[PDB]
Design a protein around this ligand. Structure first.
Ligand SMILES: O=C1C(O)=C([C@H]2CC[C@H](c3ccc(Cl)cc3)CC2)C(=O)c2ccccc21
Lengths: 80, 79
């Protein structure tokens, strides 16, 4: 059903993200900078948000890259 | 990556379909994410749960009134 479609979509997307991180030397940099900019939409505070990303992004990406796509999708709740 | 952008558009389209046709989908996702707050530890977990509890409604509504391309651009997987 629709729930199972989202799960397979998530596995496909996360597999392509991992490929991107391994083969595209600008991908991670661009994503991290984009997400920092989106911090301003918050009325907590924006610089607090930019600091949180700045300190945790590398570790978050590495953790992500040592997990299977299904595991990541289950973690976020799009699978199971 | 152009593959990631199209994957995100496909996924978000199917999420919106799920929300419109599955009346337990949103509830289950929100509760799942609250449970994952426990991986952060005892004090930081209730903080995390409260953050979800207050932002989830707004996040879902915003998400359902936005085009998939717009959501994917917003998260940074498109453009
Ligand atoms: O069901 C699971 C499961 O859900 C995870 C895990 C993997 C780690 C994920 C994870 C979540 C958050 C962070 Cl910051 C890092 C890893 C969460 C899911 C497992 O590792 C596992 C191992 C063996 C049998 C079943 C299972």
């Amino acid at each position: 059903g629709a729930s199972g479609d989202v799960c397979q979509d998530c596995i496909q997307m996360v597999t392509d993200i991992q490929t991107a991180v391994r083969t595209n030397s600008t991908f991670v940099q661009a994503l991290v900078e984009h997400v920092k900019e989106e911090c301003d939409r918050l009325g907590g505070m924006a610089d607090i948000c930019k600091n949180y990303i700045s300190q945790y992004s590398e570790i978050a990406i590495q953790m992500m890259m040592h997990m299977q796509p299904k595991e990541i999708c289950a973690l976020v709740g799009f699978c199971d």
